[PDB]
């Protein structure tokens, strides 16, 4: 409401709408041709496996010398090792060039991405810590040709584009500490550079949205951001807002977000490709403003949003909806209480046993909307949410939990996680055992399982499935990504690339 | 050591376990018409099947059928029971009336469940038996499913338990006098012979008995004596590494955990070699600790492997087997293992004891090293079973044991066995590269407890155990966390043995 | 629009505070013999001193002395009281008996304590006053110590509190009718004049009133009105930055904390410039939060302390140039409220990641100290911030000693000296910024508002947080006073703080 | 009791009794003279302040070259920066020498050591993480002349001498991962090298004792260790053991340790210097075997023990006793309970309100013993213990809390902390306010304060003072070092060097 808050929020919106990646992509031969051996700056990174680093091709790289060779002997698996090279030609004027070597492990379980982009990210992040002038371009030579996972890994790495440090609040929270990164693959990448940029951009935008505090990213600013992208890329945007949610029967999302300063919203984005589509897919994302899980609770909405943008920018031949379930879970006079009975959009009634379990209610309305109210009926519904603490206990910090009603779709999403690096793992799909945990005396169901130690991740997924439209007969993929959205440095931008890869193999 | 009255009681308990015979027998409709000539075994009869099965024309031809039973079939609810009286129906007891209880089994079954839904079968029969006046009757249980293994275990599990301390049963070696003899009547002669199904049911019930038993009756000593009793009776080998020998021979894990207790810790290994050439060499390792209300059923894993072993011997399955019971009493005392102890495990690796609550995995570490390094053979497959983590319930729930497995193939096979047997399982994340860092220790090779509890808890405990496998072992390792599936609100379920029996069948 | 009845009540409460006059006066034995000619003020008299002081020949010469009083002196316990009746002793109330209560003060006093032990003095007089008959009486309190400032504050603190809502006092603007007038009688004419000691005692008791008062009476609005009332009455300046102006003018800390409340947050700055050339330029900053374990009851302690210390300075015309900035905000649960994970742009320009909304006090103070050190007509030589800030304070320095986090040995020593002299004792906590700073690492903001590890000098770290928001224009001594526990005891507020400041100002 | 446990314990005892430091000390000129410019190995460390690193003297060091200069520019404050130097002469046969530069801050509060040995330790630790082979000697060039604090700082740093990793349990838990470190000061050190070695040795032994788990360091093995040092250095040792404690009236330590497998012990060591002593000092140390504080609970006993050893080895002119209060706090049939009333050795009775507060009881007997039962009466009593969680809340992780009955002794111990780097800070000394917290209905006192938020560190100190002998009229210094004894790598060996420096300035 105050003039100063509004100026700040508009500026934040614009920063998101206009966000451009700091990463570019090329290959060794094209690099020799365009830069003619002259390093982009006083810092260069070389990243690969023990074996890859020893390949004869490496000796032919423009920064190679006997010190770099020694760096390769001395570096530890999963570690870095830096050397100075005197009088190596570079576009900055630097008497020395720093070359940081990083060794990626080859060890990778059957549930992991063989290229180990998790370590790639860590290695580059460590290398960039030795940067003191930030307005430079750092050449990152990677010896893997797994272009999609490497792109997302590098996009994720280092200092984040969202920052409030050292006066950055006056610059719309755009960090001035980020380095431009030029990724140099060995071979011309199987996915074109402009496309990889789009992927990286989405990873970073997703990261931005999740890193952003709730006083900047609100249900209102998120909506404005979506609208900005809709006008810029020419897709459709529908907004069902505040008291319209109540009037139109969306009792779940309405009751959850009803007491807040900013009104709850169901924001649906529509993309129809030029051709005949390979699949019709609906994305549903949870975005709550309220355990330091709460910091990253936009993860799901941000993920589906950014996955959607990538699909539009790459013109993927998938017909897509993206429904953002946006609500501010506020303590107030008009707020939903324990013991409220809600009439969901699906027509089913929900006894609110516990107000802490709001996410699934909001998602219930979301998935019903996606499966019942759009101009098409999807073949696949993917819901993504930072939903349960149980997720971490079950599948851990690197693997999102999958609750899926069909072996085939589950396998495909697992495959995509392994290819993209945004790994997943299944949780028990057994509705006959989940259902009884929601018995209610007076409503069709409760919102919270009676016993917390009876497949917690699965049960939350089950709840959501009860609100799918009868008109939907396809594959439903529930993605609990409570933990994979973040690490000790903040948001990871997990989700979008998983989706992009999933879409590619339809 | 012990008072004369305690020792008499413990011997009698040992004998009750060693001599335990199942209350269940198995036949089929045609054999039943032949042997009983339409006369019911008693004043109660149970009919159990799916909505469709119950409506099959064969059902009308059953000896207890009448228009009231037909009405029962119309009125019964899915997953429920409905009982009717039939006047003057011939029966070997009594009995002016016969009670016929109809139970409807659902057909709904997810891809991770057993299609026959033996979970409901158990519940239905349990409910029906609640209307029994007199015990020491035989109740005919007519089942319409031909899934004989899962039904056998399901009926074995059901109803009143053979272990009891109620109404003076303590003076009868804790053998319940409230159990009914049950005669299961399949539609067709069973694909697995009756004597074999009895063996399976017996193991389910013995396992149940061992887990139901309180820790003042089932001790590291009485469990060992029970194993020895079975060894003498069925002719298999038994090795016992006991107390201070554990320390001298380098088993620092199990030694330090159980060292302060009244009864000494023990590593009890059983050996079975079949007559022929074996299809596989398998080693079973089971955790058996005496210490929220998970602790009541903390013998679940040791009991499971023990009873699975017994079934293999009784059925003469063509598998070469070891069964190592890791038995220790986790006691508070003067000589006890503390927080911050560093233990030298049998594997040679050192373990920093961050938390004494996480003892189960240490004990198992010694167990799996023993099995993979110290026996007359090297196993192709190691299966460890334990009631290990609360996380298991959160992850896979109350009906599915969590599987941490190092090989897709073995995992798929054990899942298949769970689905066939009814003792269902589900996988947890196998990703050692991410589990390992959770056990970083300043001074030892590893800690015994993960730094962060919310990073795949079931998996990490499994990982810990794998670090103690012998380098000689290059096969499939299956870790089974069955903390919750071993029990329900009625006590022990006897989960585990039948899973193993079915897994062994399809090797 | 509050209801008509609430507004009447609140105006009356404001007036009670603005017009508050102490119940204590001060004289000496010789001036007493001269004015009262041996006639006791009333049917109760108190005699308070050390084991040795009580036995001094001067004592026998006091007008209430008799052999029963002597026997009281023998029988009384250290730290205890012992009362005797004296029949027919002359007194102005026309009472058949006079009650004489003797109290023995210990001489034991550690190097970190006030040697006069005013803590016990307070307790002794409190006990004595429990035997009071009539409520309109003056009770002569004969003290055998000449430590006038600490004794003045000790007596001001003692007994029944001027704030009361018992027995219909709500209809009398919460002015207790159970308080006795107290006449303190020193052995020698006091080194500080009586009219000055009255001003001290008044500030102690006003501070006590402000802290005792519940949050439905003392609000950000009524506290501001009270300050304004004192400004019109004593002729000092008052600046008020209020509500949405706080946001517009960049005070993001105090604005975000108090933003969802019924009553708007306020930064209230008072200005006093003495007639002469000042010995020091000092800025006081005080935290005053209303929440919307039982530390919360007394959470105005810091704002009240600095406010009352300021008033004493104006009334005594101390030669110090003073600002007093009250950081007033209601921490309310609501639709428009600041959340966990918010990033705030402080007035200092530094950004703060709100890890925990419970740690609001330091944020509000951050804006306060920046305002004081950057936005005023002068730049202070010394900044003193006072707050009921951490539970850690009690664990570290205890119930009687406020924790000092100070950037300069000299200023610390002086404030300690003032505590020991005034009786409002302090003790230092670790000053080590190089070790405090890493506890506030934030991924996205300049700092968090809460230390990563609670067991790494908790009182110090909160102090450190506050220092990060000092203006670069400031190069002087900063004294952070964590008084979470010394502001109260089992009877309510203690009025701790003002007298400490007054004594600190005296020795500049 | 088993043969294998006893073999292991004897070997552990021996490892402690015979422990020799891995650190040696010299200076630049003596180094040029002995090594003639040839580095000790393939790794060299240079550590100093921003200003010190830029001094002209630095360019004259044998490893200097333009890459090292560039390292000096690029390094961050509190950080390290490593470069390879090709073909620099070194005694190992190494084609390259790694030179790691570390920048020490000059920022230091009035309560800190100006040389910032805390950062020195961290810098050297980081540098040694790049060591290829162990059993090399690493030259550590320091630009500070604060020899005592640098000595302890380097002693503390890197991989610890106690280890159970990778088969070290079969080598009496002597790590094989440690490097020999040669510290090279600019000027010949004001304290001789052999003396600095004794200091470093004590720091590391103390570290060893505290790192050691309770199944290795027991009341019995610690006693055997003390006895081993007594035979070797020729000082006296008195042991009051088990049921003798009860018979001789030590009811505190007896009742605490009475139920354990190993008997409680009061172990007193006696050292009398050749001359007339400058002071008579009694050390008392708490050593309990029993939430992540419990790991390092020998800290106090280990500290006084090792401080004592340094005094004997340096022949400091101080008459010393060192009383180790050793007890195993066990759950058992014969154990001390809540609500027990104990008759302390001092004659005062203690109501055991809470068994968790055992440390102070044990110390009460210790200080009475020291002040009443020895051949001399001390002028100063110093008790050291890992006593309260409150300590961390009050004075933090780097500063031990001092509860002292005399301004002069307090100031001197603070001065020693600042000089030695083993920093301290005072807690409130106010007995008139501590005493009432211990009111007991039936005993002279309770063992635990009624209110936990009334100067917790101070109150525990007060309790201990009540058991001082009336014969004693000197300075009492209580040192609560619950937190400074450890960091994320284990024990710090905090305490001994503080004492040594304190003794130097008497």
Q: Tell me the backbone φ, ψ of residue A126, rounded to 5 degrees.
A: -65, -45
D351, D448 in Cβ contact below 8 A?
Answer: no
Distance from CA of A182 to the nearest CA of D (A): 22
3-class secondary structure, A155: helix
Residue C37 DSSP code:
T
Distance CA C266, CA C245 (A): 9
Q: Using alpha carbons, list the distances in angstroms from residue B501 to A57, A111, B403, B493, B506.
A: 55, 29, 17, 16, 9
Distance CA D116, CA D197 (A): 20
Strands D137-142 and D180-185 turn out to be parallel
Strand locations in A274-313, DSSP E?
Answer: 279-289
Q: Using alpha carbons, list the distances in angstroms from residue A143 to A60, A63, A189, C13.
A: 13, 14, 12, 77
Distance CA B377, CA D267 (A): 53
State whether D179 and D205 are in the same domain. no
Burial readout D313-337 (b: 16 or more C-beta within 10 A, e: otherwise): bbebbbbbbbbbbbbbbbebeebbe
Chain C residues whose beta carbon lies within 8 Å of the beta carbon of residue A4: 247-248, 250
State whether D115 and D207 are in the same domain. no
Chain A residues whose beta carbon lies within 8 Å of the beta carbon of residue B456: 392-397, 399
Inter-chain residue contact B454 with A392, CB threshold 8 Å:
yes
Distance CA B197, CA B182 (A): 13
Q: Is the dihedral of CA D25, D28, D32, D35 positive or negative?
A: positive
Q: Using alpha carbons, list the distances in angstroms from residue C81 to C51, C75, C125, C133, D436.
A: 12, 9, 9, 18, 18
Distance CA B460, CA C231 (A): 67
Distance CA B297, CA B401 (A): 14
Angle CA C489–C492–C494, to nearest 5: 65
Burial readout D264-273 (b: 16 or more C-beta within 10 A, e: otherwise): bbbbbbbbee
Tokens matching residue A210? 């999740």
Tokens matching residue D453? 């938020």
State whether C123 and C261 are in the same domain. no
Distance from CA of B294 to the nearest CA of D (A): 24
C468, C348 in Cβ contact below 8 A?
Answer: yes
Count of other CB atoms within 10 angstroms of residue D55: 13
Place of tokens 């190995």: D41
Distance CA B16, CA A203 (A): 65
Distance CA C368, CA C349 (A): 13
For residue A490, the chain C residue with the least C-alpha distance is: C443
Tokens matching residue B134? 């007199």
- Where is chain D broken, named by the residue before each break, C–N > 2.5 Å? 290
The domain in which residue D301 lies consists of 189-506
| 3-state SS, one letter per residue, for C407-471 | CCHHHHHHHHHHHHHHCCCEEECCCCHHHHHHHHCCCCCCEECCCCCCCCCHHHHHHHHHHCCCC
Place of tokens 């090594």: D35
Edge-to-edge strands, sheet with B24-28: B24-28, B181-186, B138-143, B44-50, B97-105, B81-87
Tokens matching residue A427? 């949780």
Distance CA B331, CA B345 (A): 20
State whether A338 and A454 are in the same domain. yes
Tokens matching residue C175? 């002015």
Count of other CB atoms within 10 angstroms of residue C67: 9
Distance CA A387, CA A465 (A): 14
For position D400, which CATH number holds? 3.40.630.10
Chain D residues whose beta carbon lies within 8 Å of the beta carbon of residue C396: 390, 393-395, 427-428, 455-457
C248, A3 in Cβ contact below 8 A?
Answer: yes
Distance from CA of D456 to the nearest CA of A (A): 30
Distance CA D390, CA D164 (A): 32
DSSP string over D77-141? BT-EEEEEEET--BSS--SEEEEEEEEEP----TTS-TT-HHHHHHHHHHHHTT-SSSS-EEEEE
Strands A96-104 and A43-49 turn out to be parallel
Distance CA B301, CA B289 (A): 9
D327, D253 in Cβ contact below 8 A?
Answer: yes
Place of tokens 């002086």: C414
Tokens matching residue C183? 């006449």
DSSP string over B217-257? TS-HHHHHHHHHHHHHHHT-EEEEEETHHHHHTT-HHHHHH
Distance CA C402, CA B6 (A): 64
Domain C-terminal end among C158, C189, C220: C189
B223, B191 in Cβ contact below 8 A?
Answer: no
Tokens matching residue A431? 């509705």
Residue C387 β-bridge partners: C482
Domain C-terminal end among C189, C211, C226: C189
Distance CA A236, CA A314 (A): 17
Place of tokens 């955790």: B287
- Tally A–B CB contacts below 8 A: 116
Chain D residues whose beta carbon lies within 8 Å of the beta carbon of residue A130: 74, 81
State whether D256 and D109 are in the same domain. no
Distance CA D390, CA D377 (A): 32
Which subunits count as partners of chain B given 3+ CB pairs below 8 Å? Answer: A, D
Cβ neighbours for B225, distance < 8 A, ≥ 6 positions apart: B14
Q: Using alpha carbons, list the distances in angstroms from residue C366 to B172, C257, C327, C346.
A: 77, 12, 10, 8
State whether C481 and C357 are in the same domain. yes
Classify burial at C229, counting beta carbons within 10 Å of its beta carbon; exposed 0-12, middle 13-18, buried 19 or more. Answer: middle
Q: Using alpha carbons, list the distances in angstroms from residue C219 to A461, C237, C291, C330, C483.
A: 48, 21, 11, 8, 20
Longest distance between any two alpha carbons in chain D, whole Å: 79
Query: Which of B395, B410, B419, B440 to mutate against chain A (most A CBs within 10 Å)?
Result: B395
Q: Tell me the backbone φ, ψ of residue B236, rounded to 5 degrees.
A: -120, 165
Edge-to-edge strands, sheet with D236-241: D236-241, D265-271, D318-328, D279-289, D380-385, D475-480, D400-404, D424-426
Count of other CB atoms within 10 angstroms of residue B274: 15
Distance CA B478, CA B503 (A): 12
Chain A residues whose beta carbon lies within 8 Å of the beta carbon of residue C342: 213-215
Inter-chain residue contact A130 with D83, CB threshold 8 Å:
no
C423, C119 in Cβ contact below 8 A?
Answer: yes
Inter-chain residue contact C395 with D396, CB threshold 8 Å:
no
Burial readout B396-433 (b: 16 or more C-beta within 10 A, e: otherwise): bbbbbbbbbbbeeebbebbbebbbbbbbbbbbbbbbbb
Q: Using alpha carbons, list the distances in angstroms from residue C237 to C282, C368, C377, C391, C501.
A: 15, 17, 12, 35, 20
Q: To what resolution in angstroms was this structure determined?
A: 2.6
3-class secondary structure, B294: coil
Query: Which of B432, B450, B456 to mutate against chain A (most A CBs within 10 Å)?
Result: B456
Edge-to-edge strands, sheet with C44-50: C24-28, C181-186, C138-143, C44-50, C97-105, C81-87
User: Integer distance in angstroms from the first to the last C-alpha of chain B?
Assistant: 47
State whether A195 and A175 are in the same domain. no
Evaluate the omega torsion of the peptide bond into residue B95 and state whether it is cis, within 30 degrees of 0: yes
Q: Is the dihedral of CA C224, C225, C231, C234 positive or negative?
A: negative
Q: Which of C486, C507, C255 lies closest to C393, judged by CA? A: C486
Distance CA B498, CA C94 (A): 100
Strands D236-241 and D265-271 turn out to be antiparallel
Angle (deg, nearest 10), helices C498-506 and C301-315: 40
Classify burial at C94, counting beta carbons within 10 Å of its beta carbon; exposed 0-12, middle 13-18, buried 19 or more. Answer: exposed
State whether A284 and A386 are in the same domain. yes
Q: Using alpha carbons, list the distances in angstroms from residue C254 to A52, C79, C203.
A: 56, 45, 27
State whether A180 and A207 are in the same domain. no
Angle (deg, nearest 10), helices A147-155 and A407-420: 70
Domain C-terminal end among A188, A208, A235: A188
Q: How many residues does chain C have?
A: 508
A136, A41 in Cβ contact below 8 A?
Answer: yes
Please indicate whether chains C and B are in contact, defined as at least 3 beta carbon pairs under 8 Å: no
For residue D162, the chain B residue with the least C-alpha distance is: B443
Structure solved via = X-ray
Distance CA B110, CA B262 (A): 47
State whether D271 and D393 are in the same domain. yes
**Least CB–CB distance from D261: residue in B247, B334, B339:** B334
DSSP string over C135-176? SS-EEEEEE----HHHHHHHHHTSSS-SB--STTGGGGTTB-
Residue C102 β-bridge partners: C47, C82
Strands D380-385 and B476-481 turn out to be unpaired
Q: How many CA atoms lie within 13 A of D213 on its CB side?
A: 25
Q: Using alpha carbons, list the distances in angstroms from residue A239 to A9, A224, A228, A270.
A: 20, 10, 13, 12
Distance CA D490, CA D292 (A): 11
Q: Which of D47, D43, D86 lies closest to A86, judged by CA? A: D86
Distance CA D301, CA D386 (A): 9
State whether C144 and C246 are in the same domain. no
Q: Is the dihedral of CA D462, D464, D466, D472 positive or negative?
A: negative
Number of domains in chain A: 2
Distance CA A484, CA D405 (A): 55
State whether B429 and B470 are in the same domain. yes
For position A154, which CATH number holds? 3.40.50.10590
DSSP string over C254-267? HHHHHTTSSSPPEE
Chain B residues whose beta carbon lies within 8 Å of the beta carbon of residue A456: 394-395
D473, D383 in Cβ contact below 8 A?
Answer: no
Cβ neighbours for A259, distance < 8 A, ≥ 6 positions apart: A330, A331, A332, A333, A334, A335, A336, C335
B106, A432 in Cβ contact below 8 A?
Answer: yes
3-class secondary structure, C236: coil
User: Assign residue B48 a region: left if phi > 0, alpha if psi is -120 to 50, beta otherwise?
Assistant: beta
Distance CA C382, CA C474 (A): 9
Q: Which of D311, D299, D239 lies closest to D271, judged by CA? A: D311
């Amino acid at each position: 409401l105050p003039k100063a808050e509004a100026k700040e929020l508009s500026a934040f919106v614009q920063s998101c709408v206009e966000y451009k990646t700091n990463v570019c992509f090329t290959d060794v031969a094209a690099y020799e041709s365009n830069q003619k051996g002259v390093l982009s700056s006083g810092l260069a990174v070389l990243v690969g496996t023990h074996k890859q680093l020893r390949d004869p091709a490496v000796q032919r790289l423009p920064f190679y010398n006997p010190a770099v060779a020694e760096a390769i002997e001395r570096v530890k698996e999963g570690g870095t090792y830096g050397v100075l090279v005197e009088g190596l030609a570079n576009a900055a004027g630097s008497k020395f060039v720093r070359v940081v070597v990083g060794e990626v492990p080859t060890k990778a379980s059957r549930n992991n991405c063989p290229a180990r982009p998790d370590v790639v990210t860590a290695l580059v992040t460590a290398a960039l810590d030795e940067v003191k002038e930030p307005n430079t371009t750092v050449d990152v030579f990677v010896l893997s040709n797994a272009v999609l996972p490497i792109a997302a890994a590098v996009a994720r790495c280092g200092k984040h584009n969202f920052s409030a440090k050292d006066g950055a609040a006056a610059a719309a929270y755009n960090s001035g500490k980020v380095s431009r990164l030029q990724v140099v693959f060995p071979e011309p990448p199987a996915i074109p550079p402009k496309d990889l940029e789009a992927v990286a951009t989405s990873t970073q935008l997703c990261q931005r949205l999740v890193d952003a505090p709730p006083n900047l990213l609100t249900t209102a600013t998120f909506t404005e951001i979506a609208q900005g992208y809709a006008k810029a890329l020419g897709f459709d945007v529908d907004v069902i807002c505040g008291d319209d949610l109540c009037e139109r029967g969306y009792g779940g999302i309405y009751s959850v977000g009803k007491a807040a300063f900013e009104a709850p919203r169901l924001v649906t984005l529509l993309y129809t490709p030029k051709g005949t589509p390979v699949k019709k897919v609906s994305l549903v994302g949870k975005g709550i403003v309220y355990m330091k899980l709460m910091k990253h609770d936009m993860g799901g909405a941000a993920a589906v949003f950014c996955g959607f943008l990538t699909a539009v920018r790459l013109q993927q031949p998938v017909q897509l909806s993206c429904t953002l379930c946006l609500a501010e879970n506020a303590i107030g006079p008009k707020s939903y209480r324990n013991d409220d009975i809600i009439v969901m959009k699906s027509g089913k009634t929900v006894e609110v046993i516990n107000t802490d379990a709001e996410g699934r209610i909001v998602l219930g309305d979301g998935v019903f909307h996606a499966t019942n109210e759009l101009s098409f009926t999807p073949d696949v519904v993917i819901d993504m949410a930072t939903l349960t603490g149980a997720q971490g206990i079950a599948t851990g910090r690197h693997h999102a939990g999958l609750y899926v009603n069909e072996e085939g779709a589950e396998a495909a999403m697992l495959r995509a996680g392994r290819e993209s690096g945004e790994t997943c793992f299944p949780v028990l799909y057994c509705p006959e055992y989940h259902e009884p945990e929601f018995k209610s005396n007076h409503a069709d169901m409760t919102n919270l399982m009676e016993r917390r130690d009876n497949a917690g991740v699965s049960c939350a997924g089950y709840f959501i499935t009860t609100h799918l439209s009868p008109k939907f007969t396809g594959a439903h993929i529930h993605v609990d990504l409570a933990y994979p959205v973040f690490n000790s440095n903040g948001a990871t931008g997990f989700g979008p690339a998983l989706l992009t890869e999933y879409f590619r193999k339809l």
